[PDB]
Structures are given as C-alpha cells and as structure tokens.
Amino acid sequence: QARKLVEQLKMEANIDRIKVSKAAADLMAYCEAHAKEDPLLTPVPASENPFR
Amino acid sequence: QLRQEAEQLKNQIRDARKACADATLSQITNNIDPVGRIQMRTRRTLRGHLAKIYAMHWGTDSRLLVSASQDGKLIIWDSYTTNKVHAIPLRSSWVMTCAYAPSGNYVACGGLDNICSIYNLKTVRVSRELAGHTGYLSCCRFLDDNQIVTSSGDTTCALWDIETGQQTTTFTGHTGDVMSLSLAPDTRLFVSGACDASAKLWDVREGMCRQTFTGHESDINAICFFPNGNAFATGSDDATCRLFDLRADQELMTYSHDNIICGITSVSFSKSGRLLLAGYDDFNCNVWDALKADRAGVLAGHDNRVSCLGVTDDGMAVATGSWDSFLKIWN
Amino acid sequence: WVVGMGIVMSLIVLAIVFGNVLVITAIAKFERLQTVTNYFITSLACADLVMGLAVVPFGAAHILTKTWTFGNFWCEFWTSIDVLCVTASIETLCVIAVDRYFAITSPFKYQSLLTKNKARVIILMVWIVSGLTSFLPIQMHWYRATHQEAINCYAEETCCDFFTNQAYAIASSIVSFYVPLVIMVFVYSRVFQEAKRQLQKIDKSEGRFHEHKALKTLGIIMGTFTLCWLPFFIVNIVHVIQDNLIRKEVYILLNWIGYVNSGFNPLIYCRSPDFRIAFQEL
Amino acid sequence: QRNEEKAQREANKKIEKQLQKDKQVYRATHRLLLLGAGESGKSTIVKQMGIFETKFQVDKVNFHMFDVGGQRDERRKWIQCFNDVTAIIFVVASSSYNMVITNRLQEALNLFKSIWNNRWLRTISVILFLNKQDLLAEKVLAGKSKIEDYFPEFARYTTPEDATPEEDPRVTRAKYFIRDEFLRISTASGDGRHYCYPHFTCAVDTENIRRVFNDCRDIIQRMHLRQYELL
Ligand SMILES: Nc1nc2c(ncn2[C@@H]2O[C@H](COP(=O)(O)OP(=O)(O)OP(=O)(O)O)[C@@H](O)[C@H]2O)c(=O)[nH]1
Ligand SMILES: CN[C@@H]1CCc2c(ccc(O)c2O)[C@H]1O
C-alpha cells in the first residue's frame, strides 16, 4: 500500500507542463473559430428550427 | 520513511505547477466581447413518468432520448412529435443511471442492485447482465457496440466485455464513491469525479491513472469534457464549478456567486464550448460564460430538484429532467 | 341616500368577481394545484362567479330604480339563475366535507375511493340536480302564487317581485339548505372526534418531553356558512306559514346577507402555502 | 409521410393505456425501509414474519419492504433515494450496553441521530423496535454488569409514573431509561412533521405486522390531519 502510493506520485511528477498563457489562448482560439456553428448563441430562424 | 517520501513528492508536484502560471484565463479574455443576454423558452414537455427521474441520455440522431424513473420504467421518447416509442419494465425499482448506444441498437441500465443490464431494442428483451461490483452503480457509458465502462460505489471503475460478461480491466485508486464519468471525443481517455473531492484521468488501453486534480472541497457530483478534449469541468455540492486543463495540470477558473448556496447536480457544455449549463438544487438551472465567468441566463420552469441535463450533438436543444416527473426541451 | 347605497353595492360586486377569478386562474395556470380536491373548489368558484356577475348587479339596479324595465321574460330568467346559483353553491360545500371525511376516517382506501372520473361525475350530477330545481319548475309556472296581489304582479310588466306557494317554498328550502346542513354537521363531528383522539394519543407517548387549532378551524367553517344562510331559510318558511308576520324589506335584507357569503369562500378554502405562493407569483 | 404519422400515434395509445393500469397498483401500495445497527437481529424479525425485497399483504392492504445489505459504509450517499417511503423501521439490540465491539448502544444512538437530522428525511416517521428484551432482563437480574458504569446518567433515574410493567422493577427501569435515550433525540430535533413509535420486541413475538399496520395507519391519519390544518 505505502510502496504503491510512493511509486504513483513519482510517475505523475515526471510529466511535461506547458504555461497557462498557451492553454488559455488555445481555448479562446477554439471558441472563436467554432462560434459560428453554435445555434444556442445565435438563435436560428423558425423556418430551420425543428422544435418551432 | 515511506510516509516522508510521499510528502516530499507532493511538494515537488505543487512547486512545478507554480512556475507555469504566467497569468490567468480571466486576464487574457478581458478584451473579448461579452456574450450579452441569453433567453430560452420551453418548446416541449414530456409526461408519463409516475415518479421522480434520475437519468437521461440523448441519442446520436438528436431526435430520440431515453429516461429512467424510480417507478421502474425506461421510456424512449420522440422529442419532435412527443410520442412514446418504448416502455421497458425493470426487475429492480431502484435505478440510478441509463445510457443509449452510439448505434441506437442497445440501451443500458443500472442501480442499487449492483448490476448493469443491456437491452436489445432492434430484435425488447434483456440481453445481458453484468455482475462483479460490490456497490451501487453510479454511471455507465458505451464505448462501442461491444464495450462499456461503469463506475460504482465500491471506489472502482471497470471496463466490460458484453459478449462474455467479463471485466477486461479494473481502475483503482479512489478513496471514496465514484459519482460520475465522461468519455473523450476520440474514446481513448476518461475522467471520474469521486467523493474524496478529487478527479483522475485514466487510460483505457493501458489501465493506469495519469493525472489527479484536487481543487474542490466537497463531494463531486458531475463532470464533462470540453468539446476540444483538452479540458473538463466539474460540479460539487459547495455551489462552485471549476475548469481544469490537462496540458497545464491545474485549475483555470471558478464559477460561483454570492447568492447561491445549494449543491450542483449536473453540468454540460455547449456545441462550441462557450456556454456552460449547470443544474442546481434550488429548482432551476443557470447558464454561465466559460471564458469570462458571468451569468447569462436562467431556466426556471421546474417545480422540484433538477437531476439531469443534456445537450444534443448538433446543439439545437437542451433537455432537463427533475424530481416532479417531467422532462422539458429548451431551445 | 340612494348615492350612498349604490357605493356599497358596487363594492360587493367587485369583491366577488376579483377573488373568484384569482382562484380560477391560479389553479388553471399552474400544474401543482390540479388535484381531486381542487375540482370541487373550482366548481364552487365558478358558481360564485356566475352569481356575482349575473345576480347582484341586476338586483341592485332593481332596488335602486324601484322598477323593472327588462320585461317579464328577463325577470323570470333572472329568478331562475338566482335559484340555480344559490342551490349549486351550498351543495358543493357538502361534497368538500364528505371528501375530507373520507380522507381522514378511512386513509387506506381514499386513493381508490376518489378518482378524476368520479369527481367529474359527482360535479355534473350536482349541477344537474341544481338545474332541475331552479329552471324546470319556474319556467313552467309551477311556482306561481294564487292570491290577487300575485295575479297583479304577474300581469304588470314593470313589476318584478317574488311570490310563491307553500309546497314549492318548502321543497326548495329543504333541498337547498337542510340536508347539506345535517350532513356537514355529522361529518365535522366525526372529524373533530378523530382529531382529538389523535391529540390524546400523541400526548401519552411524549407528554414529559413536551385542541385549539381544530376547534378554531371548525368553528370558522361552520359559523360563517350557518350565520350567512340560516335566517333567510328560516324566514322563507315563516312568511308562507304565516302571511302577516314577515315584511318584504327584512326578506330582501336577509337574502342579501346570504348573497354576501359568495365573497368569503376564497378567504376560507384557499388559505394554504401553495395557494399563497401562486397568488404571490401572479 | 402521412402513413407513418398514423403508425406512431397508434403505438402511443397502446403504451399510454398500459401506464394507466400501472398507476393504480403504484398508488395502492406502501413502501417501507428497514435498517439495523449491525447485530440487531433484523433478519430474524423479517424471516419470522445487492438489495432484498419482500411482499406481504394484511387486511387487503399491500406492503413492500426494502432491506439493504450490499452497501456497508460510514457514509450513506444512497439514503436520499428513500424520501418518499411511508416509514422507516429501525432495529436495535437493547441488550448490548456492555459490548464494546464505544459500546453498541452509543453507535446505534449516533446512527439514529444522523438519520433523524437529515436534509431529505425531514418528513418521514420511524418505527423503532427495541429487540432482545429477554437477554437484557437476564443481564440485569444477573447483577454482574451495571448500566450506570457505562451510562452514568443512570445513577439518578426513576421509573416514570405513567408506565405499564407486566415484573421485577429493575428491568422496567432499564427498559424505560433505554427508550427515553431515543425519545429525547426524537423530540428535541422534530417540529411536529414526523414522530417516532417505540416498541419492545422479543424473539417470540408474532404481533409485529399488526404493530407496523397500526403505525402506518396513524402516520397517514396524522399526515392528513396536519394537511387540513386540524392538528
Ligand atoms: N434471545 C434472543 N436472541 C436473539 C434475538 N434476535 C436474534 N437473536 C440471536 O441471534 C442469533 C442469530 O443471529 P441474527 O439474529 O440472525 O443476527 P443478524 O440477522 O445477522 O442481525 P444483523 O447482522 O443486524 O442483520 C440467534 O441464534 C439468536 O440467539 C432475540 O430477539 N432474542
Ligand atoms: C328571489 N330570491 C330567491 C327566493 C327563494 C329561494 C332562493 C334561493 C334558494 C331557494 O331554494 C329558494 O327557494 C332565493 O335566492
């Protein structure tokens, strides 16, 4: 139990971490690129709305 | 000796995360325009359940869905024309989860009997029963037509083989009840939120834990992947939601308000990932902004606690269920 | 004093048509208030609304102007509507009392005893029996009196008064008032007995560590209805048994005091957290 | 097109007709939840009269009881599902004041306090069975073990005047002290929305089903009386 827990923390410690300014920028870029096909943001006309 | 080494390593992990925080997500997205105001109205209301509802899953075709209720029924609906298609009675009246196959051929179920049952829609009779868990089932998701991942109250998750009914692999490491899980878009990794206020990222092929996130303070109730696949969100019963990044291995933003003190039962994202929809214990649902952490809408058409919430694959409608035995479609 | 009298009679019309519409809209708009018990309340509210819309204004105008101008046919139609609305409102209170009696005395079989179809059938039956008592005998001139003053009253077109024979007065009074009174008295006696028995049971087990409400509620429910409707239905028999004892002004005053009861039902049968929340939301 | 539209509406009617028959059975049955302190002898009570379910009918009334044995933990996350039951049945071994297993009665009292003070179980009554009475009587008349050693409040306690013993005063005093230890917690927290019904139970009693029936009848009657503002 104790030996297994020690190995797990060592395994998780040796990974590559990138800075937050890259992850936030990537999230913002994805949202800006795919905001066009978001029917919940921009309402669709009633002609093309199957529920109304 | 061994205990000292574990404490020393926990400091090394924390120290590395501090060096990667150039800035916060809030600072970068200050110049982006606000989403504004969002108003939604109920389009359909589904009736027929005799008791309070626990689970709900949309279909891949974005037209059919399934729901489970405490009275012992598993009704498949038609969201467009509001017509019941199937009604499967259950052996056990205590059901806590349900799922719908990607191909639409099967439906899964489970609950307090520690068993997962698979039904054959296009044949409706019981096709398979999976046993081996020592606690109540909490969630289940379909990898494909012949695989399924389940989480239970014995602090373990498993990957099953429906053809032979055997656990291909088992995932261990949590110290509390596992409450929810969610699959990656490519179906190669998944995350689980447990009762020890921690979330873990697993590997289906290898069967090992890779990263652990411990930002919350109480029981974690819901979890959901960002559409990109490089982030996820969680919801606990301390009235807070948090956004975690896999490549940075740390929390990015928190969504909380001073007038909310009730717990959170379910979370979900939008088609583009800009909006975050979360259900609460105060009988209504709130809509957040993922990049700015501010409220944008309220869905307050239910009379009892909201227990489930889902968004279609094409992102046209949002379905919610509650304890008053009614489903509603919001568009 | 005609100006002052019209002001008061205008306030009675508004009070009846405001609370009763509020009850109907609140039940219809929402979905948590649609139970078996509320159908009887809806029927009672509809009867009270019809009364307050089609009885009080015409009677007030007839009293103030001292002359009926709408002709004989509308006089008789107004009398028929008046009798129908009075009869169909008192009989719903008996239904509510019996519903509570069955709910409390026999709790295991209450769900099987009362259903939506049975409630609808009961309401339709009550309204049919109310209609048979009012329109059928009046419109066929079976209620008419035989003395000379009655003949002159029915002959004149400007005059619209109430004259009736002994048999019709006795039968209508009995059907409209006397059976529901004794039924409700018996029902509420049993309910009070059950309530005090449960109160005694609770005290014995938990007396060391620890009937005003029931008495007050039953007193309100019985007293309002009795004080509103008893003197009129007494003088209804009295004035026909003895011709010269009762005048007409007292008759009208007691009938109007009875009419006033229609404005109190929302204040009695609609005092619950759910109804108050619904009222606040609107 | 038009042909498929009628086909869907035909299958809906068949389903909606079946749900009407099922609603009659659902509303005419009563659900009970059975708990235990760990060694309270609750299985003996059930047998004599994942999840285990039993069905029985008394006086043409249908009852259906649930027993949970597949889950054993100090945290009960699943307890929130049973917020629509008629009553909860709590079984405790009253003859275990000297069993350290810290003793068992203290753990049972803590479990009762936790169950009573719950966010979801705020309108549910409890039928309490104080099991193993003969063992308690024997261990009291033995005189080797004293309750005041483990419960010092027993030093200053007297049998209530409104008591109905059948016997030797010591067992009556012990029984009433033990039941008051539960009645105190029951009365302190409650606000009149739910009560507790304590009973003394042994291994030879055959009248437990009658007690459950009468307690459920009282529960429903009190519910209706409180709803109609008559109590
Ligand atoms: N004298 C007496 N003995 C009892 C009583 N109830 C149980 N026992 C003893 O309990 C023994 C059997 O254990 P059970 O009663 O089945 O205990 P259990 O069912 O495992 O109880 P739980 O683990 O809490 O579910 C019997 O041999 C009895 O001696 C009782 O009411 N009186
Ligand atoms: C003109 N007013 C009428 C006269 C007689 C009468 C009324 C109500 C119910 C009855 O059963 C009656 O017989 C009164 O409303």
DSSP letters for C182-238: HHHHHHHHHHHHHHHHHHHHHHHHHTTT--HHHHHHHHHHHHHHHHHHHHHHHHHHH
Q: What are the sequence ranges of the domains in chain A?
A: 1-51
> Which ligand approaches the C-alpha of residue D104 most closely?
1
What region, left, alpha or beta, does residue B237 occupy, with left being phi > 0 and alpha being psi -120 to 50 degrees?
A: alpha
Question: B324 CB contacts (<8 Å, ≥6 apart)?
Answer: B52, B302, B303, B304
Under 8 Å between Cβ of D88 and D124: yes
Q: Which of B70, B90, B92, B136 to mutate to test the interface with D (most CBs of D within 10 A)?
A: B136
Q: Could you give phi then psi for residue D29, rounded to 5 degrees?
A: -120, 155
- Find, among B12, B251, B213, the residue nearest to A23 by Cα: B251
CA atoms of C96 and C84, how far apart (whole Å): 19
**Is D39 marked as a binding-site residue?**
yes
Q: Is the dihedral of CA C132, C135, C139, C145 positive or negative?
A: positive
Q: Which method was used?
A: cryo-EM
Q: Which residues pair with B141 in a beta bridge?
A: B149
**Nearest-10 Cα torsion for B161, B163, B166, B169:** -20
Under 8 Å between Cβ of A17 and B18: no
Under 8 Å between Cβ of A35 and B273: no
Q: Could you give phi then psi for residue D177, rounded to 5 degrees?
A: -60, -45
CA atoms of B55 and B322, how far apart (whole Å): 9
Q: How many domains does chain C have?
A: 1
Could you tell me how far CA B321 lies from the centroid of its own chain? 14
Touching subunits for chain A (3+ Cβ pairs under 8 A) = B
DSSP alpha helix (H) spans, chain B: 2-19, 25-28
CA atoms of B132 and C74, how far apart (whole Å): 82
Of ligand 2's atoms, which has the minimum distance to the CA of residue C169? 13
- Find, among C229, C235, C238, the residue nearest to C177 by Cα: C229
β-pairing verdict for B95-100 and B86-89? unpaired
- Determine the length of chain C: 282
To test the pocket of ligand 2, the residue of C83, C181, C250 to mutate (highest count of ligand atoms within 8 Å of its CB) is C83
CA atoms of C236 and C53, how far apart (whole Å): 24
Strands of the sheet containing B166-171, edge to edge, are: B137-144, B147-152, B157-161, B166-171
Q: Which residues pair with B280 in a beta bridge?
A: B264
Between C and D, how many residue pairs show a Cβ–Cβ distance under 8 A?
56
Q: Is the CB of D96 under 6 A from ligand 1?
A: no
Q: Is the CB of C172 under 6 A from ligand 2?
A: yes
Q: Is A39 on the interface with B (CB under 8 A)?
A: yes
What is the DSSP track for B82-116? T---EEEE-SSS-EEEEEE-TTSSEEEEEETTS-E
CA atoms of B182 and B167, how far apart (whole Å): 19
Look up residue C98 and give its DSSP letter.
Answer: H
- Determine the length of chain A: 52
What are B181's two structure tokens? 């899980």
What are B55's two structure tokens? 């689970």
What region, left, alpha or beta, does residue B269 occupy, with left being phi > 0 and alpha being psi -120 to 50 degrees?
A: beta
**Is D40 marked as a binding-site residue?**
yes
What region, left, alpha or beta, does residue D59 occupy, with left being phi > 0 and alpha being psi -120 to 50 degrees?
A: left
Under 8 Å between Cβ of B310 and B56: yes
Look up residue C243 and give its DSSP letter.
Answer: T
Topology of the domain comprising D1-231: Rossmann fold (3.40.50)
Under 8 Å between Cβ of B36 and B288: no
Collapsing DSSP states into helix, strand and coil, what is residue B238? coil
Closest partner CB to D225 (pick from C104, C112, C207): C104
CA atoms of C250 and B226, how far apart (whole Å): 81
Between B and D, how many residue pairs show a Cβ–Cβ distance under 8 A?
64
Under 8 Å between Cβ of B112 and D76: no
What are D202's two structure tokens? 């042994």
| Lookup result for tokens 């609906």 | B77
CA atoms of D59 and D47, how far apart (whole Å): 20
Start-to-end CA distance of chain A, whole Å, equals: 59
Look up residue D35 and give its DSSP letter.
Answer: -
Q: Is the CB of C235 under 6 A from ligand 2?
A: no
CA atoms of B94 and B110, how far apart (whole Å): 8
CA atoms of B191 and B184, how far apart (whole Å): 8
CA atoms of B53 and B306, how far apart (whole Å): 9
Q: Is the CB of C87 under 6 A from ligand 2?
A: yes
CA atoms of B56 and C75, how far apart (whole Å): 63
Touching subunits for chain C (3+ Cβ pairs under 8 A) = D
Q: Is the dihedral of CA D224, D228, D230, D231 positive or negative?
A: positive
CB contacts of D70 in chain B (<8 Å) are 112-114, 134-136
The set of long-range contacts for C111-117, using a CB threshold of 8 Å and a minimum separation of 24, is C111/D27, C111/D28, C112/D28, C114/C36, C115/C36, C116/C36, C116/C39
Under 8 Å between Cβ of B226 and B257: no
Q: Is the CB of D138 under 6 A from ligand 1?
A: no
**Is the CATH number 4.10.260.10 carried by domain A1-51?**
yes
Cα distances (Å, whole numbers) of residue C264 to A19, C11, C94, C141: 72, 14, 17, 34
CB contacts of D61 in chain C (<8 Å) are 108
- Find, among C44, C220, A38, D205, the residue nearest to B316 by Cα: A38
b/e code C124-153 from CB counts within 10 Å (16+ = b): eebbeebeebbbebbeeeebbbeeeebeeb
- Find, among D207, D200, D198, D199, the residue nearest to D48 by Cα: D207
Collapsing DSSP states into helix, strand and coil, what is residue B318? strand
CA atoms of B96 and B87, how far apart (whole Å): 17
Q: Is D26 on the interface with B (CB under 8 A)?
A: yes
Q: Is D69 on the interface with B (CB under 8 A)?
A: no
Residue type, D90: F
Q: Is B155 on the interface with D (CB under 8 A)?
A: no
Q: Is A21 on the interface with B (CB under 8 A)?
A: yes
B248/A31 CB distance under 8 A: no
**Nearest-10 Cα torsion for C74, C75, C79, C81:** 20
Q: Up-side HSE of residue A45: CA atoms within 13 Å toward CB?
A: 2
CA angle D36, D40, D43 (to 5 degrees): 80
What are D143's two structure tokens? 């005189």
CA atoms of D208 and C108, how far apart (whole Å): 19
> Which ligand approaches the C-alpha of residue D45 most closely?
1
> Which ligand approaches the C-alpha of residue C85 most closely?
2
CA atoms of B329 and B318, how far apart (whole Å): 6
Closest partner CB to B84 (pick from D15, D71, D73): D15
Under 8 Å between Cβ of C55 and C16: no
Composition of chain A by helix, strand, coil, percent to 5: 60, 0, 40
Cα distances (Å, whole numbers) of residue B139 to B158, C126, C156: 11, 54, 84
Residue type, B79: S
| Exposed / middle / buried, residue B238 (Cβ in 10 Å: 0-12, 13-18, 19+) | middle
CA of C224 to the centre of ligand 2 (A): 19
Considering only CA atoms, give the Rg of chain C: 21
What are C169's two structure tokens? 């007065």
| CATH number of the domain residue C20 falls in | 1.20.1070.10
- Determine the length of chain B: 331
CA of D177 to the centre of ligand 1 (A): 23
What are B141's two structure tokens? 């998701």
Counting DSSP H helices and E strands in chain B, the numbers are 2, 28
Q: Up-side HSE of residue D55: CA atoms within 13 Å toward CB?
A: 3
CA atoms of C116 and C111, how far apart (whole Å): 11
CA atoms of B293 and B256, how far apart (whole Å): 8
Under 8 Å between Cβ of C228 and C257: yes
- Three-state SS for C109-142 is CHHHHCCHHHHHHHHHHHHHHHHHHHHHHHHCCC
CA atoms of C33 and C272, how far apart (whole Å): 11
Considering only CA atoms, give the Rg of chain B: 20
CA atoms of B267 and B275, how far apart (whole Å): 11
Under 8 Å between Cβ of D195 and D87: no
Structural domain harbouring C194? 2-281
CA atoms of D127 and D125, how far apart (whole Å): 7
C213/D28 CB distance under 8 A: no
> Which ligand approaches the C-alpha of residue C171 most closely?
2
Nearest CA in chain C to D220: C107
Under 8 Å between Cβ of B244 and B232: yes
Under 8 Å between Cβ of D212 and D32: yes
What are B108's two structure tokens? 């899964």
Chains D and A share 3 or more Cβ pairs within 8 Å: no
CB contacts of C271 in chain D (<8 Å) are 229
The set of long-range contacts for B117-126, using a CB threshold of 8 Å and a minimum separation of 24, is B117/B90, B117/B91, B118/B148, B118/B162, B119/B74, B119/B88, B121/B76, B121/B86, B124/B86, B124/B88
Chains C and D share 3 or more Cβ pairs within 8 Å: yes
Q: Looking at chain C, after which residues does the C atom sit over 2.5 Å from the next written N, breaking the chain?
A: 210
**Nearest-10 Cα torsion for B275, B109, B220, B149:** -90
- Find, among C60, C81, C104, the residue nearest to C193 by Cα: C104
| Exposed / middle / buried, residue B61 (Cβ in 10 Å: 0-12, 13-18, 19+) | exposed
To test the pocket of ligand 1, the residue of D40, D43, D44, D45 to mutate (highest count of ligand atoms within 8 Å of its CB) is D44
Between positions 115 and 144 of B, the ones with CB within 8 A of A are: none
What stretch of H or E contains A51? none
Q: Which residues pair with C202 in a beta bridge?
A: none
b/e code B97-119 from CB counts within 10 Å (16+ = b): bbbbbeeeebbbbbbbbbbbbbb
b/e code C173-193 from CB counts within 10 Å (16+ = b): bebbbeebbebbeebbeebbe
Q: Is the CB of C86 under 6 A from ligand 2?
A: yes
Closest protein CA for atom 21 of ligand 1: D41
Residue type, B207: G
What stretch of H or E contains B241? strand B241-245
D221/C209 CB distance under 8 A: no
Under 8 Å between Cβ of B215 and B242: yes
Quoted resolution (Å): 3.0
**Is D11 marked as a binding-site residue?**
no
Strands of the sheet containing B95-100, edge to edge, are: B95-100, B106-111, B116-120, B126-130
